[PDB]
DNA sequence: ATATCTAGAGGGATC
DNA sequence: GATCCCTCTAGATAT
């Protein structure tokens, strides 16, 4: 539920240092801060924010006992994030010129998430780290800071100007700030930082150490603070005798804003002087007016019209048994195409919790799917009044979990039967081989992935299924522009977001040639 | 055209349902 | 064309040898063709009741039409299918329907097909509508109409000659005949099909009724591009191409207002005014607002427009991709289709076809930009090339061309909770295996019917035909629990010994 | 109680 | 311009 983040964000003097043509890594660190508290606060989660700023001119920390963690105060304390915080964030901090050791940081931000949420209830405590590591640190107390956070359940994520591993485009796909850049100071606390990760979770907290360029086209800082979906317990029937109890998630679903645009007066800024109402007026002339009360509701049937009562309609309706999980038949997984999908969502079926024998049995049926290479079609209805739906069930197995994946298949109501000329078959599209070879020679150039030497793995240059949906961050930067300064038009779409949505510069560069000989070879004319 | 149905020209004759019918 | 409709004509002859019959379990042809009408009348209302169907017998002794040609009585002029057509076809319908049309309508009287022609002819004429389809259905089961008289045979011939040079498609029907219908000793010359394709006698007549009286319920919305966008390569090479939905959810039709007393169809306004004075709240003296706990954003609605704005309507090619990195369960909403239109870009059919051809030889699917309409944030999309499909009728099972498939977004796939895998033995997973290959059967996209939709159609029907008791559509969805049953025996007995303990349900 | 079903304002296609 | 179709948005409302 409740979460309680704290964000350490480094500000001394080396965060401020830019090499020309690369954004200096304080600005880098303020945008992947400034996007997480506008998602935080325009998305109105309940989550507990702080922000502890080191290697700043002055000293404001419970920790400051004198000659010790200096340079280090706490800005923002435990709270919810307001406007407020968002106007700190974009003007009012500003880098300094001192430096601080960032074990420090972390004791005091330890001790901020300790010594602040007595008495409020957290069900995570996270702390984000955004810091170039080229400080000088004393490695003193890192046992106790390690027993701290395995202690008392807190994660940790690392935030460099460099990623763990052309011209460099903030936000974009490529290299990043130059891997011989990163100086001994900067090499000692990187393997410090690798140390601390591996000893915090394992051979995946280096996962968790992600660069700035990288963070803002990643969701990488929602991650462990993010709230899980709820289960829908149903059972799985094979017939009259076999069930298996199984609790089914929601895998892929489309999400949208959920605060609505409220309509009100330009005159007085309030919604109660306007309201909308719904006038009914006879089709013929003179526009009689009828009441609600005096109409009927009636359905179309050819020509003619007939009357169809809601309470007819409701007792006439098609009436379901209730929720049901019910396998028809096992089928050929060829059989069933890719591109019949329906629906808008996609079900990940696991057994029920914390149950052996459901398990064990699901784990049956799946690899019994997979060895025969099969799919298993099931009605679907996730309530008494749901409308039944016939989907796909196919097995999905990975290194540490297996369940089924669950899409809606079509009714025979949900094709459409155009037909289309053939493309082939015809003699006025054909291309010629020249035409053919310079675009499989565009093709060439313009691969999205890489394979791989010494291993039959292929690398996705352009993963768009890891990139954040633009518009929701468009609009909180919209909306927070609007709120500071409610006197200026809004503000250009940001340069990283061009980047993030903007394939490789290799790709580009790549696929010059190649798209000028498609141009001189397939003459295009715009009809007038 | 071959498919073609007779009802409504331009599209395909749907054929009936049929369910599961098992091997 | 688009707006064009459909228009349809039956052509019943109402000679005394089509109220014969060869048997009494077997329906005389009359009202085996009047239910070929029905069928295709309620088959038409689910369906395309934009489109228009006539009823027209020959050979009666009483006339009715617009020409006063004798021995032609048009029961019904081109006009869209309704259930009072419907019913009044069916009062012929059956025994002591066929005795009623006997009484008011002549039977056994000479005709003459030119004249016939020449009624359906003004019938197809006289409506002012756009058609793409002129068609006639013929119901005959006589082979040679004027196999004496050899002049009105002739000009009937030309008559035909004549309607398909000016478009109209004649159609055969023949019923049952008890020597044979032996088409091609007149009818040849005359319908429009290329050739006989069966140069039998044809003792039995269901030739293509069967399909008639097949009855399917679906909407069979017309084809029409969801969007023409135009796909750029860079910046300069962009081919016009168009997007269709070749699968959508079908959703029952919404319910229409009426007056309660009149029955008539009531037309909705909305207004907005002040709760001041009631002037009307005009769309400029009005904002969008949003209040974030304590602090009020207030923007535009041109603002609100502005702030989704990225691109430009159309694809913008990213790159191309290999189709093994597309995984199935990523799976967002549902696809569409992407095929070539030259009548924007001229030229764009070759690049078309030349990039499917390649997508389709190196198995990779083009990774572009969608952004539908102006005003919309893109999308990332993959157009996964899609070869013509043709099966052992060879027709068009799967179109050419592009499949546009949805790529969700980082924040469109959601978090799950951490679950300790628990692998089974391989006795428990053969064991499965076993109970899979029991039920196992052949699945096509056509194989089952929304029960809903089915159950909202038959109400319908029962509704506005006043029938007794609505039938009961069969729910194919709905498990076959008695056959799987006995299909399985004793294995779901040992699976469930091997898998669940004594002690568990 | 989240979700689903249902219900209303918009943007192109096509006349 | 008008009509139908299809997202999209917003609201309503049983399990």
Request: some cysteine.
């Given at each position: 539920?409740?979460?309680?983040?704290?964000?350490?964000?480094?500000?001394?003097?080396?965060?401020?240092?830019?090499?020309?043509?690369?954004?200096?890594?304080?600005?880098?660190?303020?945008?992947?801060?400034?996007?997480?508290?506008?998602?935080?606060?325009?998305?109105?989660?309940?989550?507990?924010?702080?922000?502890?700023?080191?290697?700043?001119?002055?000293?404001?920390?419970?920790?400051?006992?004198?000659?010790?963690?200096?340079?280090?105060?706490?800005?923002?304390?435990?709270?919810?994030?307001?406007?407020?915080?968002?106007?700190?964030?974009?003007?009012?901090?500003?880098?300094?010129?001192?430096?601080?050791?960032?074990?420090?940081?972390?004791?005091?931000?330890?001790?901020?998430?300790?010594?602040?949420?007595?008495?409020?209830?957290?069900?995570?405590?996270?702390?984000?780290?955004?810091?170039?590591?080229?400080?000088?640190?004393?490695?003193?107390?890192?046992?106790?800071?390690?027993?701290?956070?395995?202690?008392?359940?807190?994660?940790?994520?690392?935030?460099?100007?460099?990623?763990?591993?052309?011209?460099?485009?903030?936000?974009?796909?490529?290299?990043?700030?130059?891997?011989?850049?990163?100086?001994?100071?900067?090499?000692?606390?990187?393997?410090?930082?690798?140390?601390?990760?591996?000893?915090?979770?394992?051979?995946?907290?280096?996962?968790?150490?992600?660069?700035?360029?990288?963070?803002?086209?990643?969701?990488?800082?929602?991650?462990?603070?993010?709230?899980?979906?709820?289960?829908?317990?149903?059972?799985?029937?094979?017939?009259?005798?076999?069930?298996?109890?199984?609790?089914?998630?929601?895998?892929?679903?489309?999400?949208?804003?959920?605060?609505?645009?409220?309509?009100?007066?330009?005159?007085?800024?309030?919604?109660?002087?306007?309201?909308?109402?719904?006038?009914?007026?006879?089709?013929?002339?003179?526009?009689?007016?009828?009441?609600?009360?005096?109409?009927?509701?009636?359905?179309?049937?050819?020509?003619?019209?007939?009357?169809?009562?809601?309470?007819?309609?409701?007792?006439?309706?098609?009436?379901?048994?209730?929720?049901?999980?019910?396998?028809?038949?096992?089928?050929?997984?060829?059989?069933?195409?890719?591109?019949?999908?329906?629906?808008?969502?996609?079900?990940?079926?696991?057994?029920?919790?914390?149950?052996?024998?459901?398990?064990?049995?699901?784990?049956?049926?799946?690899?019994?799917?997979?060895?025969?290479?099969?799919?298993?079609?099931?009605?679907?209805?996730?309530?008494?009044?749901?409308?039944?739906?016939?989907?796909?069930?196919?097995?999905?197995?990975?290194?540490?979990?297996?369940?089924?994946?669950?899409?809606?298949?079509?009714?025979?109501?949900?094709?459409?039967?155009?037909?289309?000329?053939?493309?082939?078959?015809?003699?006025?599209?054909?291309?010629?081989?020249?035409?053919?070879?310079?675009?499989?020679?565009?093709?060439?150039?313009?691969?999205?992935?890489?394979?791989?030497?010494?291993?039959?793995?292929?690398?996705?240059?352009?993963?768009?299924?890891?990139?954040?949906?633009?518009?929701?961050?468009?609009?909180?930067?919209?909306?927070?522009?609007?709120?500071?300064?409610?006197?200026?038009?809004?503000?250009?779409?940001?340069?990283?977001?061009?980047?993030?949505?903007?394939?490789?510069?290799?790709?580009?560069?790549?696929?010059?040639?190649?798209?000028?000989?498609?141009?001189?070879?397939?003459?295009?004319?715009?009809?007038? | 055209?071959p498919?073609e149905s007779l009802i409504?020209?331009?599209?395909?004759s749907?054929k009936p349902?049929?369910?599961?019918?098992?091997? | 064309?688009?707006?064009?409709?459909?228009?349809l004509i039956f052509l019943v002859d109402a000679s005394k040898a089509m109220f014969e019959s060869q048997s009494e379990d077997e329906l005389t042809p009359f009202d085996m063709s009047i239910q070929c009408i029905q069928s295709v009348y309620i088959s038409?209302?689910?369906?395309?009741?934009?489109?228009?169907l006539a009823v027209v017998f020959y050979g009666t002794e009483k006339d009715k039409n617009?020409?006063?040609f004798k021995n032609i009585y048009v029961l019904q002029?081109?006009?869209?299918?309704?259930?009072?057509?419907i019913?009044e076809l069916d009062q012929f319908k059956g025994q002591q329907g066929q005795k009623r049309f006997q009484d008011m309508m002549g039977h056994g009287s000479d005709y003459s097909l030119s004249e016939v022609l020449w009624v359906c002819?003004?019938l197809?004429?006289?409506?002012?509508?756009?058609?793409?389809?002129?068609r006639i259905m013929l119901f005959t089961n006589e082979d040679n109409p004027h196999g004496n008289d050899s002049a009105k045979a002739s000009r009937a011939r030309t008559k035909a000659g004549?309607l398909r040079?000016?478009?109209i498609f004649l159609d055969l029907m023949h019923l049952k005949k008890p020597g044979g219908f032996d088409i091609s000793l007149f009818y040849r010359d005359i319908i429009s099909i290329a050739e006989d394709e069966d140069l039998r006698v044809h003792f039995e007549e269901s030739s293509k009724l069967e399909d008639l009286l097949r009855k399917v319920?679906?909407?069979?919305?017309?084809?029409?591009?969801?969007?023409?966008?135009?796909?750029?390569?860079?910046?300069?090479?962009?081919?016009?191409?168009?997007?269709?939905?070749?699968?959508?959810?079908?959703?029952?039709?919404?319910?229409?207002?009426?007056?309660?007393?009149?029955?008539?169809?009531?037309?909705?306004?909305?207004?907005?005014?002040?709760?001041?004075?009631?002037?009307?709240?005009?769309?400029?003296?009005?904002?969008?607002?949003?209040?974030?706990?304590?602090?009020?954003?207030?923007?535009?609605?041109?603002?609100?427009?502005?702030?989704?704005?990225?691109?430009?309507?159309?694809?913008?090619?990213?790159?191309?991709?290999?189709?093994?990195?597309?995984?199935?369960?990523?799976?967002?909403?549902?696809?569409?289709?992407?095929?070539?239109?030259?009548?924007?870009?001229?030229?764009?059919?070759?690049?078309?076809?030349?990039?499917?051809?390649?997508?389709?030889?190196?198995?990779?699917?083009?990774?572009?930009?969608?952004?539908?309409?102006?005003?919309?944030?893109?999308?990332?999309?993959?157009?996964?090339?899609?070869?013509?499909?043709?099966?052992?009728?060879?027709?068009?099972?799967?179109?050419?061309?592009?499949?546009?498939?949805?790529?969700?977004?980082?924040?469109?796939?959601?978090?799950?909770?951490?679950?300790?895998?628990?692998?089974?033995?391989?006795?428990?997973?053969?064991?499965?295996?076993?109970?899979?290959?029991?039920?196992?059967?052949?699945?096509?996209?056509?194989?089952?019917?929304?029960?809903?939709?089915?159950?909202?159609?038959?109400?319908?029907?029962?509704?506005?035909?006043?029938?007794?008791?609505?039938?009961?559509?069969?729910?194919?969805?709905?498990?076959?629990?008695?056959?799987?049953?006995?299909?399985?025996?004793?294995?779901?007995?040992?699976?469930?010994?091997?898998?669940?303990?004594?002690?568990?349900?």
């Amino acid at each position: 539920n409740k979460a309680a983040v704290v964000l350490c964000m480094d500000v001394g003097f080396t965060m401020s240092n830019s090499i020309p043509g690369i954004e200096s890594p304080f600005e880098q660190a303020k945008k992947v801060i400034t996007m997480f508290v506008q998602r935080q606060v325009f998305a109105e989660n309940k989550d507990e924010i702080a922000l502890v700023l080191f290697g700043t001119d002055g000293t404001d920390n419970p920790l400051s006992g004198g000659d010790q963690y200096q340079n280090i105060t706490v800005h923002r304390h435990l709270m919810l994030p307001d406007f407020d915080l968002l106007e700190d964030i974009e003007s009012k901090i500003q880098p300094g010129s001192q430096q601080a050791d960032f074990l420090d940081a972390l004791i005091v931000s330890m001790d901020v998430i300790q010594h602040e949420t007595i008495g409020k209830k957290f069900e995570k405590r996270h702390i984000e780290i955004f810091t170039d590591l080229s400080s000088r640190f004393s490695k003193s107390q890192l046992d106790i800071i390690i027993h701290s956070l395995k202690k008392c359940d807190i994660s940790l994520q690392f935030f460099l100007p460099f990623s763990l591993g052309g011209p460099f485009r903030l936000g974009g796909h490529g290299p990043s700030f130059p891997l011989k850049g990163i100086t001994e100071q900067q090499k000692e606390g990187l393997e410090i930082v690798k140390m601390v990760m591996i000893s915090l979770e394992g051979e995946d907290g280096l996962d968790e150490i992600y660069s700035f360029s990288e963070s803002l086209r990643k969701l990488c800082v929602f991650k462990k603070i993010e709230r899980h979906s709820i289960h829908w317990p149903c059972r799985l029937t094979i017939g009259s005798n076999l069930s298996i109890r199984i609790a089914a998630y929601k895998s892929i679903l489309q999400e949208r804003v959920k605060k609505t645009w409220t309509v009100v007066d330009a005159k007085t800024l309030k919604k109660e002087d306007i309201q909308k109402e719904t006038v009914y007026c006879l089709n013929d002339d003179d526009e009689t007016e009828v009441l609600k009360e005096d109409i009927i509701q009636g359905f179309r049937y050819g020509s003619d019209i007939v009357p169809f009562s809601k309470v007819d309609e409701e007792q006439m309706k098609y009436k379901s048994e209730g929720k049901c999980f019910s396998v028809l038949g096992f089928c050929k997984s060829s059989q069933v195409q890719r591109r019949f999908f329906m629906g808008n969502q996609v079900l990940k079926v696991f057994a029920a919790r914390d149950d052996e024998a459901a398990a064990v049995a699901l784990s049956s049926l799946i690899h019994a799917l997979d060895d025969l290479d099969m799919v298993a079609i099931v009605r679907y209805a996730y309530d008494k009044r749901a409308n039944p739906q016939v989907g796909v069930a196919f097995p999905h197995i990975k290194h540490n979990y297996e369940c089924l994946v669950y899409v809606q298949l079509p009714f025979m109501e949900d094709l459409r039967q155009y037909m289309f000329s053939s493309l082939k078959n015809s003699k006025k599209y054909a291309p010629t081989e020249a035409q053919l070879n310079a675009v499989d020679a565009l093709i060439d150039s313009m691969s999205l992935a890489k394979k791989d030497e010494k291993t039959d793995t292929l690398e996705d240059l352009f993963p768009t299924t890891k990139i954040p949906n633009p518009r929701f961050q468009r609009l909180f930067q919209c909306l927070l522009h609007r709120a500071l300064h409610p006197r200026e038009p809004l503000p250009p779409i940001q340069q990283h977001i061009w980047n993030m949505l903007n394939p490789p510069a290799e790709v580009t560069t790549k696929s010059q040639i190649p798209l000028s000989k498609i141009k001189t070879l397939f003459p295009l004319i715009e009809a007038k | 055209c071959p498919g073609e149905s007779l009802i409504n020209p331009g599209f395909k004759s749907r054929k009936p349902a049929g369910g599961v019918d098992f091997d | 064309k688009y707006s064009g409709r459909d228009s349809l004509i039956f052509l019943v002859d109402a000679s005394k040898a089509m109220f014969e019959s060869q048997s009494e379990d077997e329906l005389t042809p009359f009202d085996m063709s009047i239910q070929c009408i029905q069928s295709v009348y309620i088959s038409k209302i689910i369906s395309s009741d934009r489109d228009l169907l006539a009823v027209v017998f020959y050979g009666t002794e009483k006339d009715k039409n617009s020409v006063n040609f004798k021995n032609i009585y048009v029961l019904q002029e081109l006009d869209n299918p309704g259930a009072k057509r419907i019913l009044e076809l069916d009062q012929f319908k059956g025994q002591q329907g066929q005795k009623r049309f006997q009484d008011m309508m002549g039977h056994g009287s000479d005709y003459s097909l030119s004249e016939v022609l020449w009624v359906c002819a003004n019938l197809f004429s006289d409506v002012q509508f756009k058609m793409s389809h002129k068609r006639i259905m013929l119901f005959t089961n006589e082979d040679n109409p004027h196999g004496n008289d050899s002049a009105k045979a002739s000009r009937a011939r030309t008559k035909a000659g004549d309607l398909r040079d000016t478009g109209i498609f004649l159609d055969l029907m023949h019923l049952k005949k008890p020597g044979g219908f032996d088409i091609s000793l007149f009818y040849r010359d005359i319908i429009s099909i290329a050739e006989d394709e069966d140069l039998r006698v044809h003792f039995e007549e269901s030739s293509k009724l069967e399909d008639l009286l097949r009855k399917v319920r679906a909407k069979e919305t017309r084809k029409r591009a969801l969007s023409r966008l135009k796909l750029k390569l860079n910046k300069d090479i962009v081919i016009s191409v168009g997007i269709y939905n070749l699968v959508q959810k079908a959703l029952k039709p919404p319910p229409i207002k009426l007056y309660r007393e009149t029955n008539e169809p009531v037309k909705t306004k909305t207004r907005t005014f002040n709760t001041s004075t009631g002037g009307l709240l005009l769309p400029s003296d009005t904002k969008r607002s949003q209040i974030y706990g304590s602090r009020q954003i207030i923007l535009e609605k041109e603002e609100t427009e502005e702030l989704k704005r990225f691109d430009d309507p159309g694809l913008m090619l990213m790159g191309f991709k290999p189709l093994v990195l597309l995984k199935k369960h990523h799976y967002l909403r549902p696809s569409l289709f992407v095929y070539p239109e030259e009548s924007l870009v001229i030229g764009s059919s070759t690049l078309f076809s030349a990039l499917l051809i390649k997508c389709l030889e190196k198995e990779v699917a083009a990774l572009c930009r969608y952004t539908p309409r102006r005003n919309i944030p893109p999308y990332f999309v993959a157009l996964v090339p899609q070869e013509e499909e043709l099966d052992d009728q060879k027709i068009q099972v799967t179109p050419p061309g592009f499949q546009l498939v949805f790529l969700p977004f980082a924040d469109d796939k959601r978090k799950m909770p951490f679950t300790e895998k628990i692998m089974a033995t391989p006795e428990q997973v053969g064991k499965m295996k076993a109970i899979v290959e029991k039920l196992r059967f052949t699945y096509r996209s056509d194989s089952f019917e929304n029960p809903v939709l089915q159950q909202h159609f038959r109400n319908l029907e029962a509704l506005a035909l006043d029938l007794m008791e609505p039938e009961q559509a069969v729910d194919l969805t709905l498990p076959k629990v008695e056959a799987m049953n006995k299909r399985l025996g004793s294995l779901v007995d040992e699976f469930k010994e091997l898998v669940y303990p004594p002690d568990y349900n």
